[PDB]
């Protein structure tokens, strides 16, 4: 398996074209009617970092759930005494660019649970092989990964 | 609301060391690398170093490595600076300011201590 | 170490015109390109990072863009509020360094 290289995203073009997680659909919203299609991961082998104390980077897309469980077993496997970690994922406050997947519950920002930046580069090359739709080596800091609509 | 609270101005006699302090409130403070940020007149802002309280890692601008110390103490959410062996070109206004896991950029800042070195 | 150089050092333009900064740097930093306004008496303020991107609750007329050595910061539509000295950082490279700063000054 070969690491992701910084900048570097997976398949090699922009997130929501029709080849990668395509096109942004709308934001999902607690209150609505689509909140329902959002289902949590309780996962123990995934750390979620939490930010907003809310538990609301656990609700995901049912393929953004499976992808990120075939993702923690790979980790695990890779690097023993080692968790996958999920920084950010549905956002309810506004805090990636307009129409990011984060809105829609389809994209998780993921780091290794020891915050060892050297490992990235192999997390998001594992995350290609769990079968998330888009990846981007996006900072130092994170992978983020996302997935196509249901 | 994240706050970061630093400590009052400093007069401080050459020669002399200075330990300036950063209390994060808001968010969880271990969790969180937090940088200091030196501003004065002659090199307008410069990067002094981080402290990632949840490894005690610690990564200095090779221009403060004889000159600044980072340390943290936890239980007060309170994040500490040393400047040693004071000079004039150490008077500044210092700040400290944290990331959110994005890269080394600065979302948050405390409001700045100002140190004043003389006699 | 990474060397950015910002001009230009000031500006003076009347409310609702257009302000152009550039920053370059001394060697390719990718898109770790961040930018902050920092109005008198105040902390710098994070307004656009990865170049482009635009911080939580900063407005519309605010943007960046570039990749590598060159970019551009843009007031659209400057407004009386954001008289400020502006700032770009990189963190391609260690040490994250800054720019020396451009001054907006409103003229009216």
């Known amino acids: 398996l070969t690491p992701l290289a910084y900048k570097q995203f997976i398949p090699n073009v922009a997130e929501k074209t029709l080849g990668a997680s395509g096109r942004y659909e709308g934001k999902i919203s607690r209150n609505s009617e689509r909140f329902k299609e959002l289902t949590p991961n309780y996962n123990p082998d995934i750390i979620f970092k939490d930010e907003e104390n809310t538990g609301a980077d656990r609700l995901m897309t049912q393929r953004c759930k499976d992808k990120l469980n075939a993702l923690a077993i790979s980790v695990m496997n890779q690097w023993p005494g080692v968790k996958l970690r999920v920084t950010e994922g549905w956002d309810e406050d506004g805090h990636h660019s307009e129409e990011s997947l984060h809105y829609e519950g389809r994209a998780v920002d993921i780091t290794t649970s020891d915050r060892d930046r050297s490992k990235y580069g192999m997390l998001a090359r594992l995350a290609v092989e769990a079968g998330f739709d888009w990846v981007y080596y996006e900072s130092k800091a994170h992978i983020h990964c996302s997935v196509k609509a249901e | 609301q994240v706050q970061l609270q630093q400590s009052g101005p400093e007069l401080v006699r050459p020669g002399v060391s200075v330990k300036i302090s950063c209390k994060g409130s808001?968010?969880?403070?271990?969790?969180?690398?937090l940088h200091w940020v030196k501003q004065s007149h002659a090199e307008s802002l410069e990067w002094i170093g981080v402290?990632?309280?949840?490894?005690?890692?610690?990564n200095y601008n090779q221009k403060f490595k004889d000159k600044a110390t980072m340390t943290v103490d936890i239980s007060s959410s309170t994040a500490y600076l040393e400047l040693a062996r004071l000079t004039s070109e150490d008077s500044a206004i210092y700040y400290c300011?944290?990331?959110?896991?994005?890269?080394?950029?600065?979302?948050?800042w405390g409001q700045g201590t100002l140190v004043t070195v003389s006699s | 170490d990474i060397v950015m150089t910002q001009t230009p050092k000031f500006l003076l333009v009347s409310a609702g015109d257009k302000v152009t900064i550039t920053c370059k740097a001394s060697?390719?930093?990718?898109?770790?390109l961040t930018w902050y306004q920092q109005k008198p008496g105040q902390s710098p303020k994070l307004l656009i990072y990865?170049?482009?991107n635009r911080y939580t609750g900063v407005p519309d007329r605010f943007t960046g863009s570039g990749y590598g050595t060159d970019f551009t910061f843009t007031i659209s539509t400057v407004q009386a509020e954001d008289l400020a000295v502006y700032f770009c950082?990189?963190?391609?490279?260690?040490?994250?360094?800054f720019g020396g700063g451009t001054k907006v000054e409103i003229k009216r």
């Open positions: 990865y170049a482009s």
């Open positions: 402290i990632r309280p949840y490894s005690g890692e610690t």
């Open positions: 808001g968010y969880t403070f271990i969790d969180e690398a």
């Open positions: 300011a944290r990331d959110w896991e994005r890269g080394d950029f600065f979302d948050y």
């Open positions: 060697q390719s930093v990718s898109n770790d």
């Open positions: 950082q990189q963190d391609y490279g260690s040490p994250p360094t």
